[PDB]
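Morning!

As promised:
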Amino acid sequence: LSDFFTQLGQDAQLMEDYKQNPEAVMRAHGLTDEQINAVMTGDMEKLKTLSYDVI
Amino acid sequence: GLSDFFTQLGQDAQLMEDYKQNPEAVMRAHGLTDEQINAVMTGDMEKLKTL
Amino acid sequence: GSLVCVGTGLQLAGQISVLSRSYIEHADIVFSLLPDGFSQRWLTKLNPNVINLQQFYAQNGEVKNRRDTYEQMVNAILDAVRAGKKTVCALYGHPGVFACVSHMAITRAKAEGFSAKMEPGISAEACLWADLGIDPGNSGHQSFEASQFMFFNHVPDPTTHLLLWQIAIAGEHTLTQFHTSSDRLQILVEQLNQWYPLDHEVVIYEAANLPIQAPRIERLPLANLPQAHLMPISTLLIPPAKKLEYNYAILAKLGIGPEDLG
Amino acid sequence: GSLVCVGTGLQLAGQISVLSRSYIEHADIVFSLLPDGFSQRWLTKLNPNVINLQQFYAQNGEVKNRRDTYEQMVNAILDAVRAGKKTVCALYGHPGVFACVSHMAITRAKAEGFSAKMEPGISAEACLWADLGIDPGNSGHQSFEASQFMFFNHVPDPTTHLLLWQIAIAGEHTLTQFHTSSDRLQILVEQLNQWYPLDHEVVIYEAANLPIQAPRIERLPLANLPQAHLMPISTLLIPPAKKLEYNYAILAKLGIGPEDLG
Ligand SMILES: Nc1ncnc2c1ncn2[C@@H]1O[C@H](CSCC[C@H](N)C(=O)O)[C@@H](O)[C@H]1O
Ligand SMILES: Nc1ncnc2c1ncn2[C@@H]1O[C@H](CSCC[C@H](N)C(=O)O)[C@@H](O)[C@H]1O
């Protein structure tokens, strides 16, 4: 998971690939179905599971 | 020459910290002329764009 | 030793500047304060000599003033500098935007004779303009920390885009709790009612930290704020209540009028 | 085709974000607006298919409204998108901070059915906090465009750090000239005197564009502003005129006082 996210955040090729077809890119990088489901529902808590407070 | 060095320096924190310790030595070692170095030390951006 | 404080942006890995990443890479030691564990893994691959400033926050229900937390962060940073280490502080976003640790560290380092500097980063405010398609220049921009807006006398310009940072702890005067209360937020709404109607639409904004994550852009009337789900990363945006009106006094001094404006 | 608007920061080469540099690299075509020729050379090595938006500014003394300049920039960007090109606009600093071209291009692209987005960048404001060691959160922050501050009704909070952008054209109502006049700046000084004394110290700030260049941090009383040497890249910072004062009405509703503040 962490490997994919770090690549995706840095690589504008991959980023535009991901936006075209998120599920296909995520499957192609090995993400599980629960990991993909976590992404498509926006559940960041489960994603961290699966892997300043004041001025 | 000049444009190479500036792009070089703006991106490379090693070279940036090398430059901060000894600006003249780093600038000479990267081929800057005395007029180019003088422009840098007096802050004359007009002249740097000329050169 | 020396000190450079950088920001890493809000998004994982890609929102740090090229120079700032290079500073992290080449550092003797890094003191971090990052939004999550994905960001922390990325940093440790960049440079394995990381000391997490998170450890100095109150642990395990324990009561701790956040100013004592920051002091310990600042002191830990300066210890590495005083020892002789080429030290980098890697904070999320912009290290000097609503964040005191780096400013205090740089002031202290400079006073003890050490080289210290701050490299600007991409802050949550910068993310908001892009995510919401708002230019702060359109009708102006005001930022305040929410609690300072309550504790002290600030007058907002209701024609601007107004930001209240750290809205989730608005009114939490002890600086020992992670969140405020709904009655505190109701007092904020009544205070804000001097300038904004109760049905005025505001936006709870949260910039995304991961590249698979959409930002939070939640629109709601101002009256409903005390019932809303707020997080420490939440910023409250209050759009203008009022459109720009002509300043005839100055236009006359300039010898022009409205339909002369280009 | 599609549209991504990025920023390159203020400093040469190193202040662009890692992702934003990658967007430029992989683009079909880039439309640029950069501070100088060193920045332009750096961009052309990243991606040789660059169209310089500078061409659309008034050339050779011609009378031209800046609004027609920006329209032509927006239209040129959209033409590449409509043709089918994966298009990037690379503006200096933050592309949506006191800059209309990218916001207008994205709005127009979205309405014609094209994917358009804005990536935040490091703006001149972000550079100022770092260069001056000022946190916008300390006592709050206000930004206005200088001419809008004159032409329309804005009330500044004199406890905040106040910024007037594009100070060099303050009061230039036609948007056909590159600079204003000292009589206009004197009218601004008199307007500002409602809140700031004539001997109030202000700062003319210019972030550096080159890595061998120090920033401009020129301190002067407000009265001397009309005689000062201003450039298009100059921003006027006006530090607080008043200290923060306690807001007794709200503190009482909160049931606390000054001595209880953490
Ligand atoms: N992801 C995010 N989205 C929106 N606002 C955020 C945010 N993360 C932090 N903030 C704002 O910043 C406050 C913490 S102060 C730290 C700010 C950070 N230096 C920056 O550059 O943005 C939060 O209370 C919130 O108001
Ligand atoms: N190098 C610089 N230092 C300080 N302010 C600057 C600057 N370059 C541009 N500005 C400010 O921005 C105005 C032009 S509008 C462009 C702003 C740019 N998008 C940014 O991110 O900053 C100038 O009039 C000035 O007020």
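Chain A has five helices and no strands.

Hope this helps with the figure draft.
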